[PDB]
Amino acid sequence: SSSQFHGLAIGNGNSNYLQVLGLANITDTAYLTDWQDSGGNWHAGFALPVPSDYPKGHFFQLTTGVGNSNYLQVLGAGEDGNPYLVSWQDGSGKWHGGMPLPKPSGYSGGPLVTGIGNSNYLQVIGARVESSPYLVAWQDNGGNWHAGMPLPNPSGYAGGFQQLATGNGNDHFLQVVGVGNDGNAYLVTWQNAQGQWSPGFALPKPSGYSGTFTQLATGVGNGNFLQVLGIGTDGNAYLVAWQDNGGNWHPGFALPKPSGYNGTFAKLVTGIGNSNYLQVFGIGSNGVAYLVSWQDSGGNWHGGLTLPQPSGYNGSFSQLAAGNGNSHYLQVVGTDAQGNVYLVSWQDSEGKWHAGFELPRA
Amino acid sequence: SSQFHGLAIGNGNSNYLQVLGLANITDTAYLTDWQDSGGNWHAGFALPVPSDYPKGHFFQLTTGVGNSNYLQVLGAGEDGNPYLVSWQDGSGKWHGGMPLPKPSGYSGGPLVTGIGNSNYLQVIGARVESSPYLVAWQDNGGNWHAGMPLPNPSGYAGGFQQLATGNGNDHFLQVVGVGNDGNAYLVTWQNAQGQWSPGFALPKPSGYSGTFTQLATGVGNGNFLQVLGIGTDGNAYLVAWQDNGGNWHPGFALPKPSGYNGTFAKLVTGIGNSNYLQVFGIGSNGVAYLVSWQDSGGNWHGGLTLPQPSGYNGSFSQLAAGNGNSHYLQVVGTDAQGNVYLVSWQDSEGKWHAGFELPRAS
């Protein structure tokens, strides 16, 4: 067993129990690091069962997706250059070895991103775009996987993308946003309820900022309004743009920073907090794990705070990830400097944050 | 990009120290920074990629010294192929590389190099799922040749989490490994004809019969080859060392920095003042340490906290070490965001000095 990780991914499994996935340091072996029960108790995991067609397989990136019958799917970028379903988890919590994804012609191995598409069909998309965007594969509601295809570039641009991210927009339509190789923020493409993909366009720039971005992340905001957050090349955190319930996009603005903090951010992730208030987390230029900002139910943004340090560790985290656990309490997990997985902090129904702890070793 | 992971270090033209790394999010291979003979640091740029993989990306990098003392940057392609990403000539110019010829059965993964018979550069699979592999070797005229499977240690064949290389004064190339069993092995060595032989379990360190998560080699007193390890107990060990007759001897737990009671991970070695072997690692408190250092009588000494660099009081997620101007040992690292810092540098007298953030790659 390995106990130190990188490349965490987080999702909900059987009975919505939170599952923290990871790549072992040195070996890049896919693991369940830990999982949390309905009492909030954390349990050590174990190496995930790998595909019979990649039987000693290793991955340089992982991500999760909710599949058929809400079976948690763990997707991985093979170190053999192929995309995989590493493993899936059934409704009893048992994990099963996966399979290679039915990828399209012209797809070149890289990191994956998932989204929930039409009829809830899980979509697995290439998260970096060297030429045209690709849907690697999609999964029907009986669990069957289907061959991918190219996806549309946005209006006016075919320069490739550093990063694609996904979120659900108006009428549940999947939106795929990306940071171009030109540093601009795009809606790359969006998918309607019948599964058809349309070209996107440049997202409106945030208030007062004409510059470029290095990273995007999405979050479900007030009124179910999709929010696209970003890190500027300036080092600041932004709401780049948000989408209304009619599908139209509106400009964002620089996020309000935690009181007293004058540094930069990177490694931005979102979470759904108390009263479903959207939370935005990030890592400071001082190494500190922060709630950058949170958004109330009216859409108003509020400066964040230093996340209350977990017991016995006053160091920095190299990655943060978030999800909802027992009673819907928001959990922020991360990897310390060695790669030990911590609950950095958890948040109660009132919005108050509580110090976490180093989770049990896989 | 200016935030990185997966740093590698080597010495290039005029022995100028070179810091290589992988851009965060995109996994693009970069020279992050280099240092001149006066000690001054300089921003890097994206490496030129192989014309057979012209928008390529990599999940791991390493370096070796090639024909004509040309620095070679090897990379594990996200397409599943091992590559020479780029090579540098004696003027400092970088050249796009090529896919390595590879043997049947080699499965894409991280690479490690070593210098073999006839100083031919050897690129070896750093993780072993079946048999150890020589991926490729380079001849004295710079041409690459496909490798072959290499021996296993006597009657262990369970694969290896990690391989490392080093040489004794007898020159023979030694390949050490942590088995999937957690045990340390001499996996194989290459004799004076370039032929490889089965190895054996290394001597275990006095006072610890448990398993290991990582090894690293270092050249110590009298150029004696030392195998360092991180125990599954989280402690740092000299696992074993090799004498001038090529016999192996058991080591012992390293003398820890006085006062320090936590664990270490992410161990790397460096050659310090007076060629004294230095061992570095990252604590469970998130702090970067010199774990121990060894004098010319071969005696080990407790280490210290590396002096925190200017402008950052957080943790580093990776340390890498190399000799720069006037041989001064440089310890570089990635902060929590991925910004590359000189963590600390050591003067001629063995005294460590606070570093600073490096120039950002363009």
PDB file of all heavy atoms in Angstrom, chain A residues 4-5 25 313 315-319 334-342, chain B residues 265-266 281-288 312 314-319 334-336:
ATOM      1  N   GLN A   4       0.836   8.256  -0.002  1.00  0.00           N
ATOM      2  CA  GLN A   4       1.098   9.651  -0.337  1.00  0.00           C
ATOM      3  C   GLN A   4       0.772   9.792  -1.819  1.00  0.00           C
ATOM      4  O   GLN A   4       1.081   8.913  -2.601  1.00  0.00           O
ATOM      5  CB  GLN A   4       2.519  10.056  -0.029  1.00  0.00           C
ATOM      6  CG  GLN A   4       2.751  10.003   1.472  1.00  0.00           C
ATOM      7  CD  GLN A   4       4.217  10.037   1.888  1.00  0.00           C
ATOM      8  OE1 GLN A   4       5.143   9.673   1.148  1.00  0.00           O
ATOM      9  NE2 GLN A   4       4.422  10.427   3.153  1.00  0.00           N
ATOM     10  N   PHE A   5       0.070  10.842  -2.115  1.00  0.00           N
ATOM     11  CA  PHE A   5      -0.636  11.006  -3.377  1.00  0.00           C
ATOM     12  C   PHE A   5      -0.473  12.371  -3.997  1.00  0.00           C
ATOM     13  O   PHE A   5      -0.060  13.336  -3.348  1.00  0.00           O
ATOM     14  CB  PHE A   5      -2.114  10.759  -3.147  1.00  0.00           C
ATOM     15  CG  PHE A   5      -2.399   9.420  -2.619  1.00  0.00           C
ATOM     16  CD1 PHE A   5      -2.640   9.224  -1.228  1.00  0.00           C
ATOM     17  CD2 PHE A   5      -2.424   8.305  -3.445  1.00  0.00           C
ATOM     18  CE1 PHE A   5      -2.831   7.974  -0.730  1.00  0.00           C
ATOM     19  CE2 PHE A   5      -2.674   7.061  -2.934  1.00  0.00           C
ATOM     20  CZ  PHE A   5      -2.868   6.898  -1.581  1.00  0.00           C
ATOM     21  N   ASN A  25       2.141   8.732  -5.269  1.00  0.00           N
ATOM     22  CA  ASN A  25       3.430   9.271  -5.585  1.00  0.00           C
ATOM     23  C   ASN A  25       4.383   8.143  -6.017  1.00  0.00           C
ATOM     24  O   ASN A  25       4.163   7.023  -5.648  1.00  0.00           O
ATOM     25  CB  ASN A  25       4.037  10.055  -4.409  1.00  0.00           C
ATOM     26  CG  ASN A  25       3.319  11.384  -4.154  1.00  0.00           C
ATOM     27  OD1 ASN A  25       2.441  11.816  -4.935  1.00  0.00           O
ATOM     28  ND2 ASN A  25       3.618  11.994  -3.028  1.00  0.00           N
ATOM     29  N   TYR A 313      -0.843  20.424  11.536  1.00  0.00           N
ATOM     30  CA  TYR A 313      -0.156  20.787  10.306  1.00  0.00           C
ATOM     31  C   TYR A 313      -0.361  22.244   9.990  1.00  0.00           C
ATOM     32  O   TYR A 313      -1.469  22.680   9.681  1.00  0.00           O
ATOM     33  CB  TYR A 313      -0.617  19.881   9.164  1.00  0.00           C
ATOM     34  CG  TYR A 313       0.097  20.129   7.880  1.00  0.00           C
ATOM     35  CD1 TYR A 313       1.416  19.661   7.682  1.00  0.00           C
ATOM     36  CD2 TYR A 313      -0.491  20.818   6.831  1.00  0.00           C
ATOM     37  CE1 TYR A 313       2.047  19.880   6.493  1.00  0.00           C
ATOM     38  CE2 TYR A 313       0.169  21.015   5.607  1.00  0.00           C
ATOM     39  CZ  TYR A 313       1.469  20.545   5.458  1.00  0.00           C
ATOM     40  OH  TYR A 313       2.184  20.706   4.285  1.00  0.00           O
ATOM     41  N   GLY A 315       1.620  23.664   7.668  1.00  0.00           N
ATOM     42  CA  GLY A 315       2.181  23.830   6.321  1.00  0.00           C
ATOM     43  C   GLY A 315       1.173  24.107   5.207  1.00  0.00           C
ATOM     44  O   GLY A 315      -0.013  24.389   5.429  1.00  0.00           O
ATOM     45  N   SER A 316       1.643  23.978   3.995  1.00  0.00           N
ATOM     46  CA  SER A 316       0.869  24.356   2.848  1.00  0.00           C
ATOM     47  C   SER A 316       0.284  23.031   2.208  1.00  0.00           C
ATOM     48  O   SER A 316       0.821  21.907   2.311  1.00  0.00           O
ATOM     49  CB  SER A 316       1.706  25.039   1.778  1.00  0.00           C
ATOM     50  OG  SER A 316       2.492  26.078   2.177  1.00  0.00           O
ATOM     51  N   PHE A 317      -0.795  23.196   1.434  1.00  0.00           N
ATOM     52  CA  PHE A 317      -1.309  22.155   0.607  1.00  0.00           C
ATOM     53  C   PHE A 317      -1.021  22.421  -0.862  1.00  0.00           C
ATOM     54  O   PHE A 317      -1.131  23.523  -1.318  1.00  0.00           O
ATOM     55  CB  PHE A 317      -2.792  22.007   0.833  1.00  0.00           C
ATOM     56  CG  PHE A 317      -3.079  21.467   2.195  1.00  0.00           C
ATOM     57  CD1 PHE A 317      -3.278  22.288   3.305  1.00  0.00           C
ATOM     58  CD2 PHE A 317      -3.090  20.100   2.345  1.00  0.00           C
ATOM     59  CE1 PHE A 317      -3.387  21.752   4.565  1.00  0.00           C
ATOM     60  CE2 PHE A 317      -3.205  19.570   3.591  1.00  0.00           C
ATOM     61  CZ  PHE A 317      -3.395  20.365   4.690  1.00  0.00           C
ATOM     62  N   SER A 318      -0.683  21.400  -1.609  1.00  0.00           N
ATOM     63  CA  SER A 318      -0.346  21.551  -3.019  1.00  0.00           C
ATOM     64  C   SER A 318      -1.535  21.378  -3.935  1.00  0.00           C
ATOM     65  O   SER A 318      -1.445  21.614  -5.167  1.00  0.00           O
ATOM     66  CB  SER A 318       0.770  20.558  -3.349  1.00  0.00           C
ATOM     67  OG  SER A 318       0.303  19.247  -3.328  1.00  0.00           O
ATOM     68  N   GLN A 319      -2.649  20.893  -3.372  1.00  0.00           N
ATOM     69  CA  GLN A 319      -3.901  20.769  -4.129  1.00  0.00           C
ATOM     70  C   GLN A 319      -5.044  20.782  -3.128  1.00  0.00           C
ATOM     71  O   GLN A 319      -4.890  20.219  -2.070  1.00  0.00           O
ATOM     72  CB  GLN A 319      -3.871  19.432  -4.961  1.00  0.00           C
ATOM     73  CG  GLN A 319      -5.113  19.288  -5.808  1.00  0.00           C
ATOM     74  CD  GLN A 319      -5.296  17.904  -6.376  1.00  0.00           C
ATOM     75  OE1 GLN A 319      -4.398  17.053  -6.289  1.00  0.00           O
ATOM     76  NE2 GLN A 319      -6.393  17.728  -7.099  1.00  0.00           N
ATOM     77  N   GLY A 334      -7.057  17.868   0.726  1.00  0.00           N
ATOM     78  CA  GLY A 334      -5.895  18.315   0.025  1.00  0.00           C
ATOM     79  C   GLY A 334      -4.714  17.444   0.323  1.00  0.00           C
ATOM     80  O   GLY A 334      -4.756  16.632   1.285  1.00  0.00           O
ATOM     81  N   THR A 335      -3.655  17.632  -0.455  1.00  0.00           N
ATOM     82  CA  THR A 335      -2.386  16.977  -0.244  1.00  0.00           C
ATOM     83  C   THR A 335      -1.383  17.926   0.386  1.00  0.00           C
ATOM     84  O   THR A 335      -1.101  18.985  -0.175  1.00  0.00           O
ATOM     85  CB  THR A 335      -1.789  16.437  -1.564  1.00  0.00           C
ATOM     86  OG1 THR A 335      -1.853  17.461  -2.532  1.00  0.00           O
ATOM     87  CG2 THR A 335      -2.613  15.253  -2.023  1.00  0.00           C
ATOM     88  N   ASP A 336      -0.832  17.486   1.544  1.00  0.00           N
ATOM     89  CA  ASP A 336       0.177  18.280   2.187  1.00  0.00           C
ATOM     90  C   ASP A 336       1.460  18.206   1.356  1.00  0.00           C
ATOM     91  O   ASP A 336       1.488  17.556   0.298  1.00  0.00           O
ATOM     92  CB  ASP A 336       0.325  17.822   3.643  1.00  0.00           C
ATOM     93  CG  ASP A 336       1.140  16.524   3.813  1.00  0.00           C
ATOM     94  OD1 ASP A 336       1.516  15.875   2.777  1.00  0.00           O
ATOM     95  OD2 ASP A 336       1.378  16.127   5.053  1.00  0.00           O
ATOM     96  N   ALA A 337       2.562  18.740   1.884  1.00  0.00           N
ATOM     97  CA  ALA A 337       3.831  18.805   1.086  1.00  0.00           C
ATOM     98  C   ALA A 337       4.425  17.423   0.768  1.00  0.00           C
ATOM     99  O   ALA A 337       5.025  17.282  -0.345  1.00  0.00           O
ATOM    100  CB  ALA A 337       4.829  19.658   1.815  1.00  0.00           C
ATOM    101  N   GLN A 338       4.240  16.413   1.639  1.00  0.00           N
ATOM    102  CA  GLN A 338       4.686  15.013   1.346  1.00  0.00           C
ATOM    103  C   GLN A 338       3.750  14.288   0.426  1.00  0.00           C
ATOM    104  O   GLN A 338       4.132  13.263  -0.210  1.00  0.00           O
ATOM    105  CB  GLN A 338       4.803  14.191   2.620  1.00  0.00           C
ATOM    106  CG  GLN A 338       5.824  14.736   3.620  1.00  0.00           C
ATOM    107  CD  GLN A 338       5.932  13.867   4.863  1.00  0.00           C
ATOM    108  OE1 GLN A 338       4.965  13.144   5.214  1.00  0.00           O
ATOM    109  NE2 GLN A 338       7.158  13.763   5.463  1.00  0.00           N
ATOM    110  N   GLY A 339       2.487  14.753   0.395  1.00  0.00           N
ATOM    111  CA  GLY A 339       1.428  14.040  -0.320  1.00  0.00           C
ATOM    112  C   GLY A 339       0.435  13.263   0.525  1.00  0.00           C
ATOM    113  O   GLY A 339      -0.434  12.541   0.001  1.00  0.00           O
ATOM    114  N   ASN A 340       0.465  13.463   1.855  1.00  0.00           N
ATOM    115  CA  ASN A 340      -0.508  12.847   2.751  1.00  0.00           C
ATOM    116  C   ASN A 340      -1.835  13.570   2.486  1.00  0.00           C
ATOM    117  O   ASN A 340      -1.858  14.805   2.369  1.00  0.00           O
ATOM    118  CB  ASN A 340      -0.120  13.095   4.221  1.00  0.00           C
ATOM    119  CG  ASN A 340       1.296  12.623   4.515  1.00  0.00           C
ATOM    120  OD1 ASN A 340       2.178  13.419   4.913  1.00  0.00           O
ATOM    121  ND2 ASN A 340       1.503  11.353   4.302  1.00  0.00           N
ATOM    122  N   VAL A 341      -2.912  12.837   2.457  1.00  0.00           N
ATOM    123  CA  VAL A 341      -4.242  13.421   2.264  1.00  0.00           C
ATOM    124  C   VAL A 341      -4.828  13.882   3.610  1.00  0.00           C
ATOM    125  O   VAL A 341      -4.939  13.113   4.545  1.00  0.00           O
ATOM    126  CB  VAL A 341      -5.206  12.433   1.553  1.00  0.00           C
ATOM    127  CG1 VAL A 341      -6.626  13.015   1.454  1.00  0.00           C
ATOM    128  CG2 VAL A 341      -4.644  12.089   0.172  1.00  0.00           C
ATOM    129  N   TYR A 342      -5.278  15.121   3.646  1.00  0.00           N
ATOM    130  CA  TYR A 342      -5.924  15.696   4.764  1.00  0.00           C
ATOM    131  C   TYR A 342      -7.333  16.095   4.430  1.00  0.00           C
ATOM    132  O   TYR A 342      -7.635  16.471   3.309  1.00  0.00           O
ATOM    133  CB  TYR A 342      -5.245  16.995   5.209  1.00  0.00           C
ATOM    134  CG  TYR A 342      -4.045  16.852   6.104  1.00  0.00           C
ATOM    135  CD1 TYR A 342      -2.835  16.373   5.613  1.00  0.00           C
ATOM    136  CD2 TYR A 342      -4.094  17.200   7.438  1.00  0.00           C
ATOM    137  CE1 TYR A 342      -1.714  16.257   6.485  1.00  0.00           C
ATOM    138  CE2 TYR A 342      -2.994  17.114   8.265  1.00  0.00           C
ATOM    139  CZ  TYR A 342      -1.825  16.629   7.781  1.00  0.00           C
ATOM    140  OH  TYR A 342      -0.759  16.491   8.652  1.00  0.00           O
TER     141      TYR A 342
ATOM    142  N   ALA B 265       9.687  12.528   3.443  1.00  0.00           N
ATOM    143  CA  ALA B 265       9.312  11.964   2.141  1.00  0.00           C
ATOM    144  C   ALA B 265      10.054  12.774   1.091  1.00  0.00           C
ATOM    145  O   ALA B 265      10.584  13.821   1.354  1.00  0.00           O
ATOM    146  CB  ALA B 265       7.822  12.061   1.884  1.00  0.00           C
ATOM    147  N   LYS B 266      10.012  12.290  -0.122  1.00  0.00           N
ATOM    148  CA  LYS B 266      10.492  13.096  -1.277  1.00  0.00           C
ATOM    149  C   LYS B 266      11.990  13.339  -1.146  1.00  0.00           C
ATOM    150  O   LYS B 266      12.520  14.493  -1.303  1.00  0.00           O
ATOM    151  CB  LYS B 266       9.626  14.382  -1.491  1.00  0.00           C
ATOM    152  CG  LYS B 266       8.184  13.980  -1.853  1.00  0.00           C
ATOM    153  CD  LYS B 266       7.361  15.165  -2.165  1.00  0.00           C
ATOM    154  CE  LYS B 266       5.947  14.847  -2.671  1.00  0.00           C
ATOM    155  NZ  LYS B 266       5.091  16.031  -2.826  1.00  0.00           N
ATOM    156  N   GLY B 281      14.971  16.248   2.369  1.00  0.00           N
ATOM    157  CA  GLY B 281      13.616  15.709   2.302  1.00  0.00           C
ATOM    158  C   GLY B 281      12.648  16.650   2.869  1.00  0.00           C
ATOM    159  O   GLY B 281      13.011  17.692   3.425  1.00  0.00           O
ATOM    160  N   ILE B 282      11.382  16.299   2.693  1.00  0.00           N
ATOM    161  CA  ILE B 282      10.241  17.156   3.106  1.00  0.00           C
ATOM    162  C   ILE B 282       9.574  16.551   4.307  1.00  0.00           C
ATOM    163  O   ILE B 282       9.244  15.349   4.340  1.00  0.00           O
ATOM    164  CB  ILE B 282       9.259  17.326   1.936  1.00  0.00           C
ATOM    165  CG1 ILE B 282       9.921  18.159   0.841  1.00  0.00           C
ATOM    166  CG2 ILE B 282       7.970  18.015   2.327  1.00  0.00           C
ATOM    167  CD1 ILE B 282       9.199  18.101  -0.542  1.00  0.00           C
ATOM    168  N   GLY B 283       9.455  17.358   5.363  1.00  0.00           N
ATOM    169  CA  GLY B 283       8.920  16.868   6.633  1.00  0.00           C
ATOM    170  C   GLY B 283       7.368  16.773   6.671  1.00  0.00           C
ATOM    171  O   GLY B 283       6.619  17.332   5.850  1.00  0.00           O
ATOM    172  N   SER B 284       6.896  16.124   7.713  1.00  0.00           N
ATOM    173  CA  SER B 284       5.467  15.991   7.933  1.00  0.00           C
ATOM    174  C   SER B 284       4.866  17.276   8.495  1.00  0.00           C
ATOM    175  O   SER B 284       3.642  17.427   8.500  1.00  0.00           O
ATOM    176  CB  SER B 284       5.195  14.801   8.806  1.00  0.00           C
ATOM    177  OG  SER B 284       6.034  14.805   9.964  1.00  0.00           O
ATOM    178  N   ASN B 285       5.684  18.220   8.963  1.00  0.00           N
ATOM    179  CA  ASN B 285       5.335  19.538   9.214  1.00  0.00           C
ATOM    180  C   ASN B 285       5.315  20.482   7.987  1.00  0.00           C
ATOM    181  O   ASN B 285       5.032  21.708   8.081  1.00  0.00           O
ATOM    182  CB  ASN B 285       6.190  20.081  10.367  1.00  0.00           C
ATOM    183  CG  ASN B 285       7.672  20.189   9.952  1.00  0.00           C
ATOM    184  OD1 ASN B 285       8.057  19.695   8.878  1.00  0.00           O
ATOM    185  ND2 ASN B 285       8.485  20.733  10.814  1.00  0.00           N
ATOM    186  N   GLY B 286       5.645  19.954   6.808  1.00  0.00           N
ATOM    187  CA  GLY B 286       5.742  20.667   5.557  1.00  0.00           C
ATOM    188  C   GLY B 286       7.045  21.373   5.284  1.00  0.00           C
ATOM    189  O   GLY B 286       7.235  21.933   4.217  1.00  0.00           O
ATOM    190  N   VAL B 287       8.021  21.193   6.196  1.00  0.00           N
ATOM    191  CA  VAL B 287       9.258  21.959   6.100  1.00  0.00           C
ATOM    192  C   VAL B 287      10.273  21.167   5.269  1.00  0.00           C
ATOM    193  O   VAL B 287      10.356  19.974   5.344  1.00  0.00           O
ATOM    194  CB  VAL B 287       9.809  22.302   7.537  1.00  0.00           C
ATOM    195  CG1 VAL B 287      11.178  22.971   7.543  1.00  0.00           C
ATOM    196  CG2 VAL B 287       8.828  23.172   8.284  1.00  0.00           C
ATOM    197  N   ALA B 288      11.106  21.934   4.578  1.00  0.00           N
ATOM    198  CA  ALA B 288      12.190  21.407   3.821  1.00  0.00           C
ATOM    199  C   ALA B 288      13.413  21.296   4.662  1.00  0.00           C
ATOM    200  O   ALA B 288      13.808  22.256   5.302  1.00  0.00           O
ATOM    201  CB  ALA B 288      12.459  22.252   2.609  1.00  0.00           C
ATOM    202  N   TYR B 312       8.636  33.958   0.899  1.00  0.00           N
ATOM    203  CA  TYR B 312       7.696  32.808   0.993  1.00  0.00           C
ATOM    204  C   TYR B 312       7.945  32.035   2.257  1.00  0.00           C
ATOM    205  O   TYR B 312       9.070  31.552   2.414  1.00  0.00           O
ATOM    206  CB  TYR B 312       7.926  31.893  -0.156  1.00  0.00           C
ATOM    207  CG  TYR B 312       7.077  30.717  -0.203  1.00  0.00           C
ATOM    208  CD1 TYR B 312       5.706  30.848  -0.476  1.00  0.00           C
ATOM    209  CD2 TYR B 312       7.578  29.396  -0.055  1.00  0.00           C
ATOM    210  CE1 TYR B 312       4.866  29.782  -0.523  1.00  0.00           C
ATOM    211  CE2 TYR B 312       6.715  28.309  -0.176  1.00  0.00           C
ATOM    212  CZ  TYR B 312       5.330  28.497  -0.382  1.00  0.00           C
ATOM    213  OH  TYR B 312       4.476  27.425  -0.511  1.00  0.00           O
ATOM    214  N   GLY B 314       5.759  29.414   3.183  1.00  0.00           N
ATOM    215  CA  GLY B 314       5.091  28.144   3.047  1.00  0.00           C
ATOM    216  C   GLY B 314       5.979  26.945   2.771  1.00  0.00           C
ATOM    217  O   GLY B 314       7.196  26.978   2.968  1.00  0.00           O
ATOM    218  N   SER B 315       5.346  25.896   2.317  1.00  0.00           N
ATOM    219  CA  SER B 315       5.950  24.608   2.089  1.00  0.00           C
ATOM    220  C   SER B 315       6.326  24.429   0.616  1.00  0.00           C
ATOM    221  O   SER B 315       5.677  25.037  -0.288  1.00  0.00           O
ATOM    222  CB  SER B 315       5.013  23.490   2.549  1.00  0.00           C
ATOM    223  OG  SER B 315       4.484  23.651   3.817  1.00  0.00           O
ATOM    224  N   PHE B 316       7.302  23.565   0.369  1.00  0.00           N
ATOM    225  CA  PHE B 316       7.610  23.116  -1.004  1.00  0.00           C
ATOM    226  C   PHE B 316       7.070  21.729  -1.208  1.00  0.00           C
ATOM    227  O   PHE B 316       7.184  20.880  -0.358  1.00  0.00           O
ATOM    228  CB  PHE B 316       9.131  23.254  -1.253  1.00  0.00           C
ATOM    229  CG  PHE B 316       9.536  24.678  -1.201  1.00  0.00           C
ATOM    230  CD1 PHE B 316       9.994  25.268  -0.026  1.00  0.00           C
ATOM    231  CD2 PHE B 316       9.412  25.444  -2.343  1.00  0.00           C
ATOM    232  CE1 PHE B 316      10.279  26.646  -0.030  1.00  0.00           C
ATOM    233  CE2 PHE B 316       9.678  26.786  -2.323  1.00  0.00           C
ATOM    234  CZ  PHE B 316      10.104  27.336  -1.210  1.00  0.00           C
ATOM    235  N   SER B 317       6.535  21.498  -2.397  1.00  0.00           N
ATOM    236  CA  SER B 317       6.010  20.230  -2.793  1.00  0.00           C
ATOM    237  C   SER B 317       7.016  19.284  -3.493  1.00  0.00           C
ATOM    238  O   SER B 317       6.691  18.142  -3.719  1.00  0.00           O
ATOM    239  CB  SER B 317       4.746  20.466  -3.642  1.00  0.00           C
ATOM    240  OG  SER B 317       5.096  20.923  -4.944  1.00  0.00           O
ATOM    241  N   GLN B 318       8.193  19.762  -3.821  1.00  0.00           N
ATOM    242  CA  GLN B 318       9.245  18.947  -4.400  1.00  0.00           C
ATOM    243  C   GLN B 318      10.531  19.776  -4.142  1.00  0.00           C
ATOM    244  O   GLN B 318      10.501  20.988  -4.251  1.00  0.00           O
ATOM    245  CB  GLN B 318       9.046  18.831  -5.940  1.00  0.00           C
ATOM    246  CG  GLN B 318       9.999  17.882  -6.601  1.00  0.00           C
ATOM    247  CD  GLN B 318      10.008  17.934  -8.059  1.00  0.00           C
ATOM    248  OE1 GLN B 318       9.111  18.549  -8.708  1.00  0.00           O
ATOM    249  NE2 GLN B 318      10.986  17.261  -8.643  1.00  0.00           N
ATOM    250  N   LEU B 319      11.616  19.082  -3.871  1.00  0.00           N
ATOM    251  CA  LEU B 319      12.953  19.580  -3.844  1.00  0.00           C
ATOM    252  C   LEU B 319      13.770  18.912  -4.923  1.00  0.00           C
ATOM    253  O   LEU B 319      13.629  17.688  -5.151  1.00  0.00           O
ATOM    254  CB  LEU B 319      13.605  19.351  -2.454  1.00  0.00           C
ATOM    255  CG  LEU B 319      12.832  19.867  -1.190  1.00  0.00           C
ATOM    256  CD1 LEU B 319      13.562  19.481   0.088  1.00  0.00           C
ATOM    257  CD2 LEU B 319      12.647  21.340  -1.231  1.00  0.00           C
ATOM    258  N   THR B 334       9.356  23.697  -5.913  1.00  0.00           N
ATOM    259  CA  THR B 334       8.034  24.287  -6.274  1.00  0.00           C
ATOM    260  C   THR B 334       7.223  24.602  -5.050  1.00  0.00           C
ATOM    261  O   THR B 334       7.067  23.778  -4.151  1.00  0.00           O
ATOM    262  CB  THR B 334       7.200  23.339  -7.142  1.00  0.00           C
ATOM    263  OG1 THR B 334       7.201  22.005  -6.616  1.00  0.00           O
ATOM    264  CG2 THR B 334       7.759  23.310  -8.572  1.00  0.00           C
ATOM    265  N   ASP B 335       6.857  25.858  -4.928  1.00  0.00           N
ATOM    266  CA  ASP B 335       5.958  26.265  -3.876  1.00  0.00           C
ATOM    267  C   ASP B 335       4.561  25.647  -4.082  1.00  0.00           C
ATOM    268  O   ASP B 335       4.341  24.912  -4.995  1.00  0.00           O
ATOM    269  CB  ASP B 335       5.965  27.783  -3.675  1.00  0.00           C
ATOM    270  CG  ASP B 335       5.118  28.556  -4.658  1.00  0.00           C
ATOM    271  OD1 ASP B 335       4.524  27.953  -5.549  1.00  0.00           O
ATOM    272  OD2 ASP B 335       5.034  29.821  -4.473  1.00  0.00           O
ATOM    273  N   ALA B 336       3.645  25.955  -3.193  1.00  0.00           N
ATOM    274  CA  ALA B 336       2.326  25.356  -3.231  1.00  0.00           C
ATOM    275  C   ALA B 336       1.591  25.637  -4.506  1.00  0.00           C
ATOM    276  O   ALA B 336       0.841  24.727  -4.962  1.00  0.00           O
ATOM    277  CB  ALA B 336       1.533  25.821  -2.034  1.00  0.00           C
TER     278      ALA B 336
END
